[PDB]
């Protein structure tokens, strides 16, 4: 929240390239969090396809003849939609051992 508020709200134009740059910044922050071993190293960030499609449908444009790649970069006004996938580590609390006599 602090990173987004400091440098992105109101200072960039809502284009596809700026969205990609913001995605890169978030991914870089997650990779920085990686080295401290707080979460897992499989984190991915990308455009929230379904939310964007729902918003476009609400605005009235027809998506029957729109390519899947075309929907990603279509205009959304001021709104931006993103999604991520991270895995959070936990401490050792249960242990199983089987010694074969």
């Amino acid at each position: 929240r602090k990173v987004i508020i400091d440098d992105y709200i109101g200072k960039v134009t809502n284009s596809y390239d700026n969205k990609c740059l913001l995605i890169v910044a978030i991914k870089s922050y997650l990779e920085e969090l990686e080295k401290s071993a707080l979460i897992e190293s499989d984190s991915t960030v990308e455009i929230d396809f379904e939310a964007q499609k729902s918003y476009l449908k609400s605005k009235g444009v027809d998506l029957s003849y729109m390519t899947l790649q075309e929907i990603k970069e279509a205009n959304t006004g001021s709104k931006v939609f993103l999604k991520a996938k991270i895995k959070v580590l936990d401490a050792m609390e249960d242990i199983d051992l089987s010694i074969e006599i």
Partner: protein, 140 residues
Amino acid sequence: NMEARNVMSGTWGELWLDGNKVAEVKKFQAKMEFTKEDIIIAGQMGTDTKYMGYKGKGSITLYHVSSRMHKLIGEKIKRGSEPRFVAISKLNDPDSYGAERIAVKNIAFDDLTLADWEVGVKGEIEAPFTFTEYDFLDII
């Protein structure tokens, strides 16, 4: 599934060099050459190989619209310092399944072309390079 329209066309590519989009681009190519050594194992006729590393190579060809390549490295080369660049290639064909983007890092160029022209011939400049690292972005 497979159809003729799905094949990507090179007219739809674009290239960013050092964060600046290059509009006068003709072709872009990157490749990785693996290093493998032959190993003969007793009792088997077929030879087997062991992989040891890779080497990256490529080139850029672009129309001679402006003297872009000089301003990058011309003065730095004489002094003895070699710069490293980052290139991004995006291939976005409307017919194909989306687009693929790749970042090629640690690029070092092989040569610099001061002047090349001939009467009755349009000008072109091609520059080969070598790299070490790469990323995958929005692969299909």
